[model samples]
Target chain A: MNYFELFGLPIQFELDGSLLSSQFRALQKRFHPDNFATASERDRLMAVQQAAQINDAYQTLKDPLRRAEYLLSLQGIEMNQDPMFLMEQMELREELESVTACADPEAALVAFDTKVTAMQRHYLAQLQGQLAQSEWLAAADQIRKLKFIAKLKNEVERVEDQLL
Target chain B: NYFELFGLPIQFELDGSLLSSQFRALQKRFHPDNFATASERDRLMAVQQAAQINDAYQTLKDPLRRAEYLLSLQGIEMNAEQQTLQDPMFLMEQMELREELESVTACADPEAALVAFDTKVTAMQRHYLAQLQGQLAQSEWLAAADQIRKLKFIAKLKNEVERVEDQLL
Candidate 1:
């Protein structure tokens, strides 16, 4: 069963976080192991899996990036296909090496982060239109890039955290 | 699960060094070195658990895999495709970029376009990143997602450029 259907949500990138939580809690209660404690062996096994699925669904819907990617998956459009995307990932990662190598790595980290954040902001802004168009091959692509940006930018932070 | 394995919070901003710290600790506990004199079954379990820790640590330590796992936990799978570039202009641009990359003979007065192609690919990533910064700041997730796809096309061409350069080298 798809996550949106599981939670009675429409397949859209932007969604109400609170609603997802409420649905999750309700589902959890409905499938809590105690509710199946006296059931047969097969029933117990199913309850455990059902609650696990609920938790997974809740986690995916709670995050904006994951939700966006999940929506694309529903449409059969996967993220990170084209080469241009991965190349950017490679280059951004290479740039991370330079940031740490600089004379003033802390200042470099800030500058690099500022640049990456600015890039991230721009990418996030474009999601609505492409998602709206559907096939959303392009929209799904954006989510993958955002994933790349988040990862690389986080790397810079990881290094800075180490040095400081 | 990876973060849990390291006793770290399940968030993006993990301390890189802690991964090593936890990995070493877990390895020492499960290491077959310590189990050399133990029973055969005991040694086997230790080996299995140690292998698991190694796998978990690497996933958490690598940013891309970390993000992908974070997504997976949320019930998402994101291995994108063998699809071509998103639009006509991009396709044309890559066609031209690859053709130039294959023609590289390098230098300031360079007749070989590969040197220039190398320069161009880097510039191109910078350009896409700048675009990403703008879209994300605007919270334009859909438009941004499309750019990610466009960036993929660029990534493919970048790899093709490498092929051309390797031919020259």
Candidate 2:
């Protein structure tokens, strides 16, 4: 079963975090290995196997990129490989790499972070709209873009941490 | 390069506590602010080296990432996006362990449950570590790489267990 079916959630770009966590915790209570410790050997492995499935489902749904990719896959759409977007990503990375050298590193970082944040938000909005409209191809493109943005977002935080 | 940068042996296992000490020492010497009164070129170099030290510390302290670094030194690099574990049984076991982690809160003594869970995860990590020591030493590149992949899963499981512990405690 798809992760959405497994978690009883709608298969879409956006997921309700608390709802997913609640369902995941409930599923764990049902299939947790500890609960079947004294059962037959067959039952023991069965719980482990089933529980594994739930964990995988929950993790995939929890991550935005993975969730988008999974949604694309659900539609039987294959992601087949952008250049302006590529250049923009490279430039942002270049700017990030030089943040430490800037006269005002913290302010530079804050601005860099804000730019990346806006980029991510824009892509996320596009992703949501594309998925809702069943634009599998467009949504996949957004996923790829967002994946780059995700890494940049992480690097921004790392740079911020270093400044601290 | 990380081992040389940190002045440590190039192996899968190293003294983490010592690494921490060396990291602090390096940071103190290379921190950019210390070079703020120096020439611009010197300041830039300090910033570069400081960042490099931070990256090195991050990679070496994490077992899975450390193993990956070791593999890269041997001219073998694992692409995480494309790599899939060939061992179905191990994959299944990882799933089971994750499920058990999720269920820890429901256990009679949740703290005790987490303790047992952490012990099992650590044991699994050590098992892989033993394999990595032998494999990397023998230059068994592929074998060591596979062990790193398995270790990656175990590392993530441990992280999850920590998150659960944070919530429970």
Candidate 3:
């Protein structure tokens, strides 16, 4: 179930998490496994499952990025497959390689790290813009890009193990 | 459910302010105190629900934790119960990583080991992350889930290596 559905709220990108939390806590007390210890095993199990789902939904919907991604996934837009996103990944990898091949590997590593960090910042900015405009499509694209850069940057850090 | 409450859904990302705002607003509405004038039973219920909401909000607002939570929403559970590695290549890599870890543990200068382990993890993280992205793009949510599970394993391995390196000093 969607976060909104889980919380019994309307499905939307924005939500008052505090309100959600209050509702969630109230539900937890109502259906907590501890409250059903004397109930039938089946009833107890069902409560556990429901409580788990509620907790999960609250967690996902409370955050902006995850909530956005969750909405996209539900819509079947899966941002990971966009061609532009793939292109950005390739470009990022290339930049990493180029930046790391400098005469000074140490300096090269630093430069590469900076470049990737900037890319991350850039994509994040783009992501915010897309979300602000409610351009979920663009936001998904940017998220894909950001995810790639983050992974690549991690890889570069690994390569710099010698210098550290 | 105003989009602006959580910040706009755009290509550019937002900072914590947007999240903090929506969170506070919601908290005020659902806080147990708001139900003070209501029946005792209702007031108590409100307080309990508020706790759950707070726990969830606190976790989702952070990036790393958010990633894990997002995976869970995709039916990707990350606990030990969810552990499973099926790829022979990945298994081999894990073995190799373990061996490298062993070597590092035996080294006189743990720094060297740390460096080597860090390099390997970086490579592994990149390799798996790319694979994960491919799976995600293909709408292979299940596959992406599996890949991320393996990534977590690698991350654990890295943490272990770091711990051993620390012991050397």
Candidate 4:
């Protein structure tokens, strides 16, 4: 079953974060094990499993990147290439590796963080359009680009910790 | 985000005054308090946007980051994970430079030698930086990537020399 279906949301790039959270809370409470405590053992186990699934759905829907990827996956789209783009990522990663050596490491990371946000926004704009048009191939490509940007974003954070 | 977010041109150079003013304006506009009475989602999203604005300011304020970011926006790329430096002549320079670094400790006037060493390294850095600027201006991404790689090594070695100076004096 689609996570969107479970959350009662339309399967699309943009999501109503407030509504998702509300549905998540309601579903979670509805399946709380405490309410199933007096039921049969099988019933309690089912409630626990349902709650877990709801949590997973909420997680997928709430995150913009993950939600877009989920939308692409629902259409069976997959990305397998990008030479120029990958080259840029590799170059950026190279810069990331030496951020600490810069005269101002914090400034370096801040710069990197900004670059990542711009890249993510670029892909996200494309993703919204692609997903809306049901252009699985293009949407899949955006997801792929976003996954790399997200990875770099995490690395920038990790480097920030190193600085701290 | 750094350039456009602050209404600056997407170039290596920037107007410092405008960037600072725009950043403050963005922060005020996206402040969480401005969305306090809004939905919970809006409040959280405002905070996230505020953080991004802060990050954009940091990036655009530094020359090194600004240059690197410009190249990224241009779509250039590089790698060093199991991939060695590809410039044969540059690799040769690095080796000789390393040898010079090792000889610094044995010199009679270590401090004097280190000063000269730093000057030479700084000169090399400036040379590559000039090349980087020209290459970037001409949209020579691959060549610019090479210069950036060379600069990184220069930076790494510069730090090494500093550490050695600390140990000696």
Q: Pick the candidate with the highest TM-score.
A: 2
lDDT of 2 at B145: 86
- Which has the higher TM-score value, candidate number 1 or candidate number 3? 1
Off by over 4 Å in 3: A1-164, B1-39, B58-85, B130-134
Ranking by lDDT: 2, 4, 1, 3
Q: What value does the lDDT take at residue B114 in candidate 1?
A: 65
lDDT of 3 by residue, B52-125 (tens): 66776665554335445556655666654634644568678778878778776444444445765666677777
The CA lDDT of each predicted structure is: 0.71, 0.82, 0.67, 0.79
Model 4 C-alpha lDDT per residue in residues A1-164, reported as the tens digit of each score: 78999987877777766577778889988998899999999898988998899999998887777787777678775445689999999999999999877765756776787678777878889889978998887777788888889898778767866764
Report clash pairs, candidate 2: none
Q: Write the per-residue lDDT of candidate 3 for residues A10-113, one digit (tens) a residue.
A: 76665665577678888778878899899999998999998898878777876556777887777676753768768867876776676544444555775676
Q: On a 0 to 1 TM-score scale, where does candidate 2 land against the true structure?
A: 0.50
Interface RMSD of each: 21.8, 14.3, 25.0, 26.2
- In candidate 2, which residue ranges exceed 4 Å CA deviation? B1-169
The TM-score values for the models, in the order shown, are 0.44, 0.50, 0.39, 0.48
- For candidate 1, chain B by itself scores a TM value of 0.61
Question: For all the candidates, what are their Cα RMSDs to the real structure?
Answer: 25.6, 20.3, 29.3, 26.6
Candidate numbers, best TM-score first, in rank order: 2, 4, 1, 3
The chain B TM-scores of all candidates, as shown, are 0.61, 0.81, 0.63, 0.81
